[PDB]
């Protein structure tokens, strides 16, 4: 694999701190992977076909229990994207880690890769893998009113097919927070 590529830094972090940190310690068992549906992708979509995913969806997890607890919190985020195919495909998709997402417009499309990112083509990668360290306005956050992050993908190359390949591909990804303090 291309291996991990970090967002802005690579380091073990502060984990234990002041009153709220003392009150909102690293509840490690709040952590667990799962899978989300992303989108479909056939020879149909021409370039520019955006598809966004706000974060984080509800989830029947201990994490998910607290994300309703409706309280000051902080979190981490670890992303691992892929889409199984076969070496006769061809193209290029773009995976994206967006801070403070806004509805884009045609012209700015051509700018995406400001953000941390990888490439998506059945040759080089088979496993995207990306992590954002926390941030936000407060030292902490309360979700429901806001979303500091989102996980978006959009076309970066038309998709090719021959007889040998599979005319449809599904795309998965891996979403689970880390480094949680509540």
């Amino acid at each position: 694999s291309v291996g991990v590529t970090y967002g802005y830094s690579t380091e073990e972090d502060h984990v234990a701190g002041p009153n709220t940190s003392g009150l909102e310690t690293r509840v490690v068992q709040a952590e667990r992977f799962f899978k989300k549906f992303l989108f479909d992708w056939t020879t149909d979509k021409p370039f520019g076909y955006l598809t966004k995913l706000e974060l984080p969806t509800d989830h029947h997890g201990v994490f998910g229990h607290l994300v309703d607890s409706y309280a000051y919190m902080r979190n981490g985020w670890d992303v691992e994207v892929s889409a199984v195919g076969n070496q006769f495909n061809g193209g290029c998709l773009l995976v994206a880690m967006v801070p403070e997402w806004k509805a884009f417009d045609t012209r700015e499309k051509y700018q995406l890769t400001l953000f941390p990112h990888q490439f998506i083509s059945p040759r080089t990668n088979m496993t995207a893998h990306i992590t954002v360290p926390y941030l936000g306005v407060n030292r902490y956050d309360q979700y429901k009113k806001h979303k500091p992050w989102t996980l978006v993908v959009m076309v970066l190359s038309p998709l090719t097919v021959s007889n040998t390949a599979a005319p449809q591909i599904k795309v998965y990804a891996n979403i689970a927070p880390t480094y949680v303090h509540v």
């Binding site: 070496q87 006769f88 061809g90 700015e108 490439f119 040759r123 970066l156 090719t160």
Partner: protein
């Protein structure tokens, strides 16, 4: 006991560039030091190094139409600091707010066919005024050129030397002459191996050299 009041004869303009400062008023106020926060940076340039870009062709499709047959000419674009080939371009906007600029320019290439497929391509510079675009790899080569293959690598980054008139140039271009400022610097290829449908990507970026002098608004604020 007055000190000689060597008064000022006509200076001290409230004007733009000035470095003069002011007086805190509801002042003397701390803030929690903002170190250790991520996403720090200083330089539009330097952040424009690790980040590549994209391009555009009249087909409005960022990637390159990459015909795969007996054709020899691939396609030809231009690289100004402001040109239809390079509008939607993290440099130009940052650029277009300037007049003087200097230093090398960067590019990229990303392949599309399955790795098995052999391939040949040839980047090539052309100086602004050869009076004729080349039409064969070896005679194209006479200006500047290089190679790679699908073999052993898929990415690549390329550069044109910062040729000019003087050791600087104008960002915007003129409406008083004809000759293109740079040329039509583009790519050739040797026999395509096999492909039902290729595709190419391409970028630009800051590197060791992309520099500027400065600055004024052009726009209609």
């Amino acid at each position: 006991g007055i000190f000689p009041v060597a008064c000022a004869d006509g200076y001290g303009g409230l004007v733009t560039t000035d470095p003069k400062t002011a007086d805190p008023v509801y002042g003397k106020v701390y803030n929690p030091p903002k170190t250790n926060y991520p996403g720090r940076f200083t330089n539009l340039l330097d952040v424009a190094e690790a980040c590549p870009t994209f391009l555009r062709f009249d087909d409005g499709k960022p990637y390159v139409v990459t015909r795969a047959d007996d054709t020899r000419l691939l396609a030809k674009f231009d690289v100004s600091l402001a040109a239809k080939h390079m509008s939607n371009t993290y440099l130009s906007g940052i650029a277009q707010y300037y007049t003087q600029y200097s230093g090398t320019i960067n590019l990229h290439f990303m392949f599309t066919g399955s790795t098995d497929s052999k391939a040949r391509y040839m980047v090539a510079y052309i100086p602004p005024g050869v009076e004729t675009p080349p039409d064969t790899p070896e005679e194209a080569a006479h200006c500047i050129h290089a190679e790679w293959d699908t073999g052993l690598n898929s990415k690549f980054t390329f550069s044109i030397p910062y040729v000019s008139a003087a050791d600087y140039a104008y960002t915007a271009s003129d409406t008083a002459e004809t000759t293109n400022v740079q040329g039509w610097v583009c790519v050739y290829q040797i026999t395509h191996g096999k492909a039902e449908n290729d595709t190419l990507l391409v970028s630009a970026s800051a590197g060791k050299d992309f520099e500027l002098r400065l600055p004024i608004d052009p726009r209609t604020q």
